[PDB]
Amino acid sequence: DDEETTALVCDNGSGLVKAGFAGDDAPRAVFPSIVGRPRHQGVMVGMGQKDSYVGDEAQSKRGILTLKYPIEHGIITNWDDMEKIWHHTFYNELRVAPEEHPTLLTEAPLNPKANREKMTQIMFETFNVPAMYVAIQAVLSLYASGRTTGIVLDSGDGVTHNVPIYEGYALPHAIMRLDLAGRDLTDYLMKILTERGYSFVTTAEREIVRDIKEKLCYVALDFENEMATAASSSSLEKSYELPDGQVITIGNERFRCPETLFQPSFIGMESAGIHETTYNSIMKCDIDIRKDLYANNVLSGGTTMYPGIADRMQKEITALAPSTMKIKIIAPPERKYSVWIGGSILASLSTFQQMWISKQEYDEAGPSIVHRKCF
């Protein structure tokens, strides 16, 4: 590289911040988005103890911290912590001053306006970027698949949203946003582990339960048969070693944790599972583009990485859909970073180079410029 100017494709997310320069294949730095103040007193003098460890540093000292995510469900609830996370991302994980780089944030659909306006105001006043643009997290995941149609189910860690798109024309009346995501699955797993004796309570042990969920849980192809099998044999019980020994054995908690996605009544949510909100999102579309959406169903986001979900979802939709249509579920192996790869592709386009919100435009219309033509 050299002259010229590259764009910063940041992607706030909720659970893992993924960032990197535009035009690559994978994000340069991926690290949890947690800011944890120490909670004990501290007796050693001169140890160089800081007041807040952010990012991946607080996943190593988590034994004496109180980690707290600054993004609850897509929306940002603690602006100071989010500013700290952004500052860390720019200066220590990429080491590029923001004064010389455009930024491309990402935002979930149907989010509060004030969140987006505050985001752009921060990026323009504190970090003082040249130009920033905010994009919907599902269109990027559709970019990365190399398609131009299809209905994308982006089940992140904060919020699961399902944006249908045809021929490049998004259908704003058919977006079905559901707030069940990876975090609720972690909490439900932590709640059903107590049925064997293992109690995880501290906010640090939520990370251990998350690791258990990632490494062991899988989505059952048929729920009742698995419940019957796990209750008779013992071929499912997989063991796992805690960060201090005392291995634990997970029985039928393995496929009961991610089953909450298809039956949100487990955690008390009323709505229908991710297998039926996709069909409802399709049926709201026009009658002539339903075949294409059926054939190009796209999966993205981290939580769709459970082993065996691309078959359960296809079976469910085939049960719901008319018998003639072909149901195909696109599940690329690079699912987790699909949104960021799409973001890189979009930022690398020449046609897109004039859509950025230039700073002089913000100076003339204020932060409310984001809702205007420069979307």
Ligand X SMILES: Nc1ncnc2c1ncn2[C@@H]1O[C@H](COP(=O)(O)OP(=O)(O)O)[C@@H](O)[C@H]1O
**Per-residue x/- marks for ligand X, 192-221, CB under 6 A?**
------------------x--xx-------
Is there binding between residue 167 and its own copies (CB under 8 A)? yes
336 is in an annotated binding site: yes
Q: What token pair was written down for 17?
A: 């911040």
Residues 299-358 close enough to bind ligand X by CB under 6 A: 301-303, 305-306, 336
Angle (CA) 342-348-343 rounded to 5° is 20
* Shortest distance, position 40 Cβ to its own copies, whole Å: 4
Single out the residue of 32, 30, 73 nearest to residue 207, CA to CA.
Answer: 32
Collapsing DSSP to helix, strand or coil, 8 comes out as: strand
359 is in an annotated binding site: no
Residue type, 36: G
* Shortest distance, position 15 Cβ to ligand X, whole Å: 4
| Among ligand X, other proteins, its own copies, none, residue 136 binds (CB under 5-8 Å by kind) | its own copies
Single out the residue of 144, 165, 174, 177 nearest to residue 74, CA to CA.
Answer: 177
* Shortest distance, position 191 Cβ to its own copies, whole Å: 18
> Could you tell me how many residues make up the chain?
375
Cα–Cα dist 116/188, whole Å? 30
- Of 16 and 257, nearer to Mg ion (C-beta) is 16
* Shortest distance, position 38 Cβ to its own copies, whole Å: 6
Long-range contacts of residues 113-117, Cβ cutoff 8 Å, at least 24 apart? 113/371, 115/75, 115/76, 116/370, 116/371, 117/367, 117/368, 117/370, 117/371
Is there binding between residue 349 and its own copies (CB under 8 A)? yes
- Of 109 and 156, nearer to Mg ion (C-beta) is 156
| Among other proteins, ligand X, its own copies, none, residue 40 binds (CB under 5-8 Å by kind) | its own copies
Among 333, 354, 360, 364, binds other proteins (CB under 8 A): 333
Residue 182 burial (C-beta neighbours within 10 Å; 0-12, 13-18, 19+): buried
Strand partners, 165: 150, 170
Is there binding between residue 7 and its own copies (CB under 8 A)? no
| Among its own copies, ligand X, other proteins, none, residue 351 binds (CB under 5-8 Å by kind) | its own copies
Q: Which residues contact 45 (CB under 8 A, 6 or more apart)?
A: none
Is there binding between residue 156 and Mg ion (CB under 5 A)? yes
Side-by-side strand order, sheet with 103-107: 103-107, 131-136, 357-358
- Of 33 and 252, nearer to ligand X (C-beta) is 33
Q: What token pair was written down for 117?
A: 């306006």
- The continuous run of DSSP H or E covering 31 comes out as strand 29-31
18 is in an annotated binding site: yes
Task: List contacts with its own copies (CB under 8 A).
Answer: 38, 40-47, 49, 61-64, 136, 139, 142-143, 148, 165-172, 202, 204-205, 208, 241-246, 285-291, 294, 321-325, 346, 349-352, 355
Task: List contacts with other proteins (CB under 8 A).
Answer: 21, 23-26, 47-48, 50, 79-80, 83, 91, 118, 121-122, 125-126, 143, 146-148, 307-308, 310-311, 333-334, 345, 348
